[PDB]
Copies of this chain bind each other. A is one copy, B any other.
Amino acid sequence: MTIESIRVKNLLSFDDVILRDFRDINCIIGRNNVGKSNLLKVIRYFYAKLENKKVIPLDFHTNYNAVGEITFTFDTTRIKKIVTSRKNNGRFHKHIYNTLFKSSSVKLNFEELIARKNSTNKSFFSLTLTICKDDSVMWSVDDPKVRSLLATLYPFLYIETRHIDLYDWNPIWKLISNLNSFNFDDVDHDELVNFLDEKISSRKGDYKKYIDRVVSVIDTKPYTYKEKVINYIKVAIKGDSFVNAGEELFTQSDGTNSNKFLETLLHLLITLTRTEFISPIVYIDEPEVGLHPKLAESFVSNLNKIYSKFKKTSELSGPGRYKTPYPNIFYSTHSPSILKQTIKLFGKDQQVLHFSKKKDGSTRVNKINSTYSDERFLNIFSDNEARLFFSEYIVFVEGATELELFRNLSLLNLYPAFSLADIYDANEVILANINPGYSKASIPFVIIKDIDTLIDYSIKTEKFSLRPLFEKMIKELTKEFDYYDTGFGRVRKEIDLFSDIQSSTKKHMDSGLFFKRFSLHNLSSRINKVSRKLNRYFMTTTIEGALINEQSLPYFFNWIGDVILTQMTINNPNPDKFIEAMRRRYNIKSQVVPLFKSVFCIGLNHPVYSSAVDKQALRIKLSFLNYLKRKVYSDFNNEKEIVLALRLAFGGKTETQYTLDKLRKDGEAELFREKIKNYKNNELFFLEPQMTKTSGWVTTFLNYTIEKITSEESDDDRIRQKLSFIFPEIISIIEQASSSIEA
């Protein structure tokens, strides 16, 4: 490894933040203004003060602390192995020994030294920089040679891709100079000059005279090591100025230029760090800025290709594969493509860090689970799943109807806060391998399911039966296995009755369509109150039942009236004569149903008719409206039967958790099923194509309801309260999600 931990106390936006357990790739994600670049500034200042540069000290998070501390724990196990060995007697190795590992092995005795040598070596070097209130800086190690050597051994390479100079890639060479280490004593400036003069002269000695003249005229300073290696590279290679795919930089784009710059630099880093013991830490800001999603994916793919091409394992070995640890690569991204490709192509060698600024202003760093044990999920992992990492509140659902509802534009207009929550339908296995409960504190979430997934009532036996999900939930909820007393006695009682519910029996009425005295609403409320600790919300019925309740019957009926008035047309190219013929053949009163069947049919396009045709159509439509009102209020005894029939037609469930298909298969409620089929095939034929779940009736219903109620009432608080009254179920979930989002 390279760095064990980084700790910041009271500097910039950090109160007390510790980052550890670094992996080969560390993806940093988080909202805008959470401190992602503040880590960069802290590390940059720490390394600038490491080399004794003169810079302004960073600002304190709060002024009620007299200190601000930065702690770095360098991992010197591999360097200790490098230098302690008797073979490496070089001068650089001798310096590293005499600076770092001397005076540390001095204090240890023979027994402890031998124990360290023989056992699994683990040596760390902890360096703390403390900034006082008067801008003075104090180190925990008072030997500046140690700090300079630590800077040399673990160099910090740093890019903000936003401020890259696209048309001049010179800053690459400097970074290359930081990477590789070798000997320069043998190469003087005399042998090289003689070689060049012998190669460049029609008469021997001329080039040496020229260089002597230039040297005599100028006054310079001896080369530093990095300048030496840069000069030798630049002389050795064929060209200095950079060219993108055979074309000059200024003709190319900006995204292409930045992508190629980053790609070449990272490729050089990984390629050149193989043979040396220098372990850099590289920090990229926005590796995706100005890049097409395809280009960002390709950038990560090429990075992983180079990373895996030099990686040696128990199976992969041979020429060109090294065990040398890879440099610690941090990059802060706001692009789901970068994160998705990072996860999919790295697996266990990547780490996702979430930066969130809390309520007071401190930054919190958390680790989001990005390793999955399921290969199928890794292969099927796509942009939609990777988008979840950037969410603020994830509302997991089960079917597509909930997606249709919670994404409604008009509904989100009146609840802007819920616009920040991403809805994602999750299967049970997908929800299991995502592990949203691991984050919880990082990304709050809720899992929305129907109560059918818990209890399956049987009409024949008049018994509830517990699904295995209920047993598993109870098993996590019987916390009392190894605990102490707390105000959880109510929880134990609730679990006791939840286990007791199995043996109880409840009678049903109307051949199994209602409960005599059992209140499924009360059971749902108790279940939700108990299971709020598990972030799971269970609805009493299906989502169609939630939309269509006894209170929502009027507006829905109004929609029927509107769907009776506007969106059908006349099924003939000759409205006048056709309407006359159908009025003649079919009576207004006795045969209104076949007359409406023949005349009107659903059509998106509305041709304009004559005024008399409009009058006739309006009279027929009003007559049909009155007839349907009378028939509906006659064939059904109370409003509850009508609501249940509407739920069943659209695909909902009864009070006993039975669908229309389930009732047909089991054979119960023959009379109600026959009435529903009669209403579908005779009077409500035009609504038949809209009866299905995926037909999009939810969107039209919600849009019309919102528009109508906004027409009735003007104030937004009034409109929200009316929405809460009319849909007590959905508005509650939206309110809960928004309240959790606000905090």
Binding site for B on A (CB under 8 A): 31-33, 37, 162, 172, 176, 180, 182-184, 186-187, 189, 191-193, 195-196, 199-202, 206-207, 210-211, 213-215, 217-223, 227, 231-245, 248, 252-256, 259-260, 264, 267-268, 271-272, 275, 286, 289-295, 301, 334, 336, 344-345, 373-376, 378-384, 387, 390, 392, 400, 403-404, 407-409, 419-420, 427, 429, 604, 694, 696, 698-700, 703
Contact = CB atoms under 8 A, between A and B. Distances in A.
Contact of A264 (B219, B234, B374): B219
Nearest to A289: B289
Given A239-B222, A295-B32, A407-B380, A186 B162 contact: no
A235 B235 contact: yes
> Which A-B residue pairs are the 10 nearest by beta carbons?
A376-B696, A220-B239, A32-B255, A221-B243, A384-B384, A376-B699, A186-B199, A187-B199, A33-B253, A211-B236
Contacts of A378: 409
Contacts of A219: 242-245, 260, 264
15 contacts: A32-B295, A33-B256, A180-B210, A191-B199, A192-B236, A217-B267, A217-B268, A217-B271, A218-B242, A219-B260, A220-B239, A222-B239, A231-B231, A255-B334, A345-B409
Nearest to A429: B694
Given A192-B235, A293-B387, A700-B375, A213 B419 contact: no
Given A200-B183, A214-B268, A219-B243, A162 B232 contact: no
Given A214-B268, A218-B237, A219-B242, 14 more contacts: A182-B206, A189-B238, A191-B199, A192-B195, A210-B272, A219-B260, A220-B237, A221-B239, A223-B239, A235-B235, A373-B604, A379-B404, A382-B407, A383-B384
Nearest to A213: B271
Contact of A233 (B191, B214, B375, B408): B214
Q: Which of A220, A275, A604 has the most CB of B within 10 A?
A: A220
Contacts of A240: 220, 223, 227, 231
A207 B192 contact: no
Contacts of A214: 176, 233, 237, 268, 271-272
B182 A207 contact: yes
Majority secondary structure of chain A interface residues (helix, strand, loop or mixed): helix
Nearest to A383: B387
Nearest to A180: B210
B380 A403 contact: yes
A172 B189 CA distance: 21
Nearest to A38: B253
Contacts of A420: 294
B33 A252 contact: yes
A234 B235 CA distance: 9
Contacts of A267: 217
Contact of A189 (B217, B236, B275): B236
Contacts of A256: 32-33
Contact of A162 (B184, B189, B290): B290
Contacts of A200: 182-184, 186-187, 232
B221 A294 contact: no
A375 B243 contact: no
Contacts of A255: 32-33, 334
Q: Which of A187, A238, A295, A700 has the most CB of B within 10 A?
A: A238
B272 A213 contact: yes
A191 B235 CA distance: 11
B292 A286 contact: no
Contacts of A215: 237-238
Contacts of A233: 211, 214
A291 B191 contact: no
Nearest to A164: B162
A286 B289 CA distance: 9
Nearest to A259: B32
A183 B197 CA distance: 11
A240 B195 CA distance: 20
Contacts of A381: 407
Contacts of A183: 200-202
Contacts of A392: 294
A236 B199 CA distance: 13
Nearest to A249: B221
A170 to B, nearest CB: 12
Given A186-B200, A334-B291, A220 B242 contact: yes
B192 A703 contact: no
Contacts of A238: 189, 215, 220, 222-223
Q: Which of A234, A243, A379, A703 has the most CB of B within 10 A?
A: A379
Nearest to A36: B253
A37 B235 contact: no
Nearest to A243: B221
Contact of A409 (B192, B291, B344, B390): B344
Nearest to A376: B696
A172 B214 CA distance: 12
Contact of A407 (B180, B227, B334, B379): B379
Contacts of A239: 220-223
B334 A290 contact: yes
Contacts of A195: 192, 195
Q: Which of A189, A200, A243, A419 has the most CB of B within 10 A?
A: A200
A400 to B, nearest CB: 8
Nearest to A269: B217
Nearest to A604: B373
A241 B220 contact: yes
Contacts of A696: 374-376
A200 B188 CA distance: 11
Contacts of A292: 31-32, 334, 390
A159 to B, nearest CB: 14
Given A184-B200, A235-B192, A243 B220 contact: yes
